Structure 1
Amino acid sequence: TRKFGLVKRTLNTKKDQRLKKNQENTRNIPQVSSALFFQYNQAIKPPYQVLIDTNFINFSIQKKVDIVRGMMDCLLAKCNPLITDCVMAELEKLGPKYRIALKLARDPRIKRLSCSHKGTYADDCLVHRVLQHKCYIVATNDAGLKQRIRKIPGIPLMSVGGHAYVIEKLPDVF
């Protein structure tokens, strides 16, 4: 009556609990914007607020366009430039050869705003803000960032060209 086919009480790896590699074992849908049409972006009216990035500052100084006047040149109306603390740190960690561009980009006409994230992947900080609030316009010259904020709906992108600036998606430049 001793139970037939008994076996030594071994240790599983596919079932047990004390293995650290075996220890690891209401939907959400973000809505589309009230301030976004199909593609019109009904919200933005002048004045505008722009976000400046490291590539934008670089090509700005390499083509000699002063910041605020070049912005008025591009946009034909009133606009305010903003940089984020992550972007400032990005220029800083680029460092000693571009310190003149740093001393330029720090100017008390540029009202810097503060971020709260680990890491300084300024691409991530930018795109998280712009999918967060849909009212900034974004100036840069990175190709990948250009493609991404092209993929997003209803956000005008702004880059350099020749000796002036240009914008991509804005339905009212003129």
Structure 2
Amino acid sequence: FEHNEALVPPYNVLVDTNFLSRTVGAKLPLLESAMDCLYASVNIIITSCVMAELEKLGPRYRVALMIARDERWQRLTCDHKGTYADDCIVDRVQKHRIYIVATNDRDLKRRIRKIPGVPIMSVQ
């Protein structure tokens, strides 16, 4: 598609809040799942906005938070945690179309496909 590649191990993957919930309440090993599909070392991360949003969810749905605050995902310190998870990831990946995005938000995925060179992952 005319997109010049320069991705190198370990892949940087932003995991969104929905994916985190999902993998938690269905017992899906998110870390190993990504290393499996990317077939290489992966650094799994979550923006501060995504994990904050989880924090609210965490008030009545305990379990996502702990996994989401795990070193496996390493925090990506965005400048705008206040912005919906969706917009957060979008504004972070818009300058760094480098990072792979794992999201359950088919709306966020659609608007990321626009940007050349953004691997997209999700759970069926």
Letter of the 2:63 partner, please give it: I
Structure 2 SS opposite 1:44: coil
| Structure 1 residues 82-131: Cα deviation after superposition (integer angstroms, max 9, x where no partner) | 11111111101223222211112111232212121263312111111111
2:47 counterpart residue number:
84
Query: Does structure 1 residue 128 correspond to structure 2 residue 96?
Result: no
Q: Percent same amino acid at aligned positions?
A: 61
The equivalent position to 2:59 in structure 1, one of 78, 89, 96, is 96
Superposition misfits of 4+ residues, deviation over 3 angstroms: none
2:2 counterpart residue number:
38
Structure 2 SS opposite 1:98: coil
Question: Could you tell me whether the CA contact under 8 Å between 1:72 and 1:78 is conserved in 2?
Answer: yes
The equivalent position to 2:74 in structure 1, one of 111, 119, 122, is 111
Query: Does structure 1 residue 144 correspond to structure 2 residue 107?
Result: yes
Q: Name which one, 1 or 2, has greater alpha-carbon Rg.
A: 1
* Backbone CA RMSD of aligned residues: 1.7
The equivalent position to 2:18 in structure 1, one of 24, 48, 55, is 55
State the distance in 1 between where 2:120 and 2:107 align.
Answer: 13
| Structure 1 residues 50-80: Cα deviation after superposition (integer angstroms, max 9, x where no partner) | 0010111122123322232122111111111
State the distance in 1 between where 2:98 and 2:21 align.
Answer: 24
State the distance in 2 between where 1:72 and 1:49 align.
Answer: 11
TM-score by length of 1: 0.65
Letter of the 2:96 partner, please give it: H
Equivalenced residues, count: 124
TM-score by length of 2: 0.88
Segments of 5+ residues of structure 1 without an aligned counterpart are 1-36, 162-174
* Residues 91, 118 of structure 1: alpha-carbon distance in 2 compared, 3 angstrom cutoff: closer
Q: Which has the higher contact order (CA 8 A, sep 6+)?
A: 2
State the distance in 1 between where 2:109 and 2:22 align.
Answer: 15
